[PDB]
Write an enzyme that holds these catalytic residues in place. Structure first.
Site: not given
Ligand SMILES: [Ca+2]
Length: 279
Positions: A16, A39, A175, A177, A200, A224, A260
């Site tokens: 936290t 990758d 959007p 993923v 996200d 990455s 935060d």
């Molecule tokens: Ca996204």
């Protein structure tokens, strides 16, 4: 359990607050899940992977990771010391050459490969794909990422390292993923991290210690590096039964540390990946 003296990013994702150094996690540790690392490959022989990593596909003359980038990312997902999900199965798909480059057509083929390949693997707790790569906006690249997600894979992708709005990059701008920005150990947005409405979640991305080729380790930075923290977290949560491939990005956002991070531009989520593990 701890990790006493864990890499800061691992400690951060179970905390936290910033400034601690022990990683706490449920011992299930992603057992029974699978994470594809799409990758430069994975050095499966690295002792840090404990036989849990394997190459399953390459588009080049070798499946060997001659770069290190893929091995580093895989280490953050699931290596014993440097990984979030220390008991997951790791599958390498080499869509990037040893210079870290790859044509979009090869990257797309790799994504569609994973969507099929999971049906040849044992992943009773669920399947994740980590894409620490990207380039300029491409509807075809976005669509491939969308298909992979639709097929039942939790897709986590790097936001990019341009200190710019990720709307102009792919697969970051897709959007459906989970698009991952990077933070530093002082809870600052990493200076290079992309941002924008399409993000996200954020994960640790500055000065991340993990595995490298030749059985070594090193610290590097990038979205990455943030991406595999989120991919590993998803695998870990899926093993716990807390979420599913279709819901994991939302769940991670729901349960993230909120408000935060510093220097998050107006309109970008202020959410930092967090396992909500109570020892
Ligand atoms: Ca996204």
């Amino acid at each position: 359990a701890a990790q006493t003296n864990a890499p800061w990013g691992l400690a951060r994702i179970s905390s936290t607050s910033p400034g601690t150094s022990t990683y706490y996690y449920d011992e299930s540790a992603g057992q029974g899940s699978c994470v594809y690392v799409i990758d430069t490959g994975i050095e499966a022989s690295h002792p840090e992977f404990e036989g849990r990593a394997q190459m399953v596909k390459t588009y080049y003359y070798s499946s060997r990771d001659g770069n290190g980038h893929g091995t580093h990312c895989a280490g953050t997902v699931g290596s014993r010391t440097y990984g979030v999900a220390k008991k997951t199965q790791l599958f390498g798909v080499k869509v990037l050459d040893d210079n870290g480059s790859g044509q979009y057509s090869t990257i797309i083929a790799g994504m569609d490969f994973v969507a099929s390949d999971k049906n040849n693997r044992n992943c009773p707790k669920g399947v994740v794909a980590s894409l620490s790569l990207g380039g300029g906006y491409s509807s075809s690249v976005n669509s491939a990422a969308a298909r992979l997600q639709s097929s039942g894979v939790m897709v986590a992708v790097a936001a990019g390292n341009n200190n710019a709005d990720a709307r102009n990059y792919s697969p970051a701008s897709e959007p459906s993923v989970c698009t991952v920005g990077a933070s530093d150990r002082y809870d600052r947005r990493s200076s290079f991290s992309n941002y924008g409405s399409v993000l996200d979640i954020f994960g640790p991305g500055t000065s991340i210690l993990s595995t490298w080729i030749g059985g070594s380790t090193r610290s590097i930075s990038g979205t990455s590096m943030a991406t595999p923290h989120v991919a590993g977290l998803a695998a870990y949560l899926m093993t716990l039964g807390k979420t599913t491939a279709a819901s994991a990005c939302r769940y991670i956002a729901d349960t993230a540390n909120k408000g935060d991070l510093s220097n998050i531009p107006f309109g970008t989520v202020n959410l930092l990946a967090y396992n909500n593990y109570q020892a």
